Structure formats: C-alpha cells, structure tokens
C-alpha cells in the first residue's frame, strides 16, 4: 500500500486493507490447529 499508493483511488484503497484483516482473521483457526496438534506429530515423527 505504500510502494504503489498511486494505483488505487480511495477505492479499493480501503478494500486492499479490507482483505488484509480477512487474511488475519482466517490465520488463527488454522495456526491454533498447527501449533497445538502438528507439534507433537513432528515431535514423534522425528524419532522413528
């Protein structure tokens, strides 16, 4: 949004950052699964 600012005109200069919050919000219900389940999976698989 800073290096290309002169390419969006008030719309969707709000939409481009509108989807960033979407990406953020979606990251959590996955990172939870990852860092709470896959962790022990690897901690085992790294010993067989």
């Amino acid at each position: 949004l800073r290096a290309f600012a002169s390419s969006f005109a008030q719309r969707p200069r709000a939409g481009v950052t509108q989807l960033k919050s979407l990406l953020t919000q979606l990251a959590d219900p996955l990172c939870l699964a990852l860092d709470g389940h896959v962790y022990h999976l690897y901690n085992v698989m790294a010993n067989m």
Binding site: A3, F4, S7, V38, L41, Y42, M45, A46
Partner: protein
C-alpha cells in the same frame, strides 16, 4: 503428502512451477506473500 515430505529425508532438489508472475502491477507482491507464508509453514522444505 506435504507434511509427510517435511520429515522425509530429501535426496533430490525440489523445484517449483514455471509461472507467469506479473511484474509492474501491484499483484506480484501478493506472489511474494504467497511463498513467504509458505516458508513460514515449512522451513524444512524451503531450505533446499
């Protein structure tokens, strides 16, 4: 398959698809975001 590849001892330099990344237009940066996120996901693969 990927998660299994994570710990499978790598014996062949993997590659990634040839793909018409567009320069100029502020979409390329999304393609940078794609693989930086991927790298966060899988350090063991990207390392090669």
């Amino acid at each position: 398959d990927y998660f299994s590849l994570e710990m499978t001892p790598i014996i062949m330099r993997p590659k990634l698809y040839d793909f018409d990344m567009k320069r100029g237009e502020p979409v390329s940066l999304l393609y940078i975001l794609e693989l930086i996120l991927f790298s966060i996901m899988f350090p063991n693969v990207t390392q090669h």
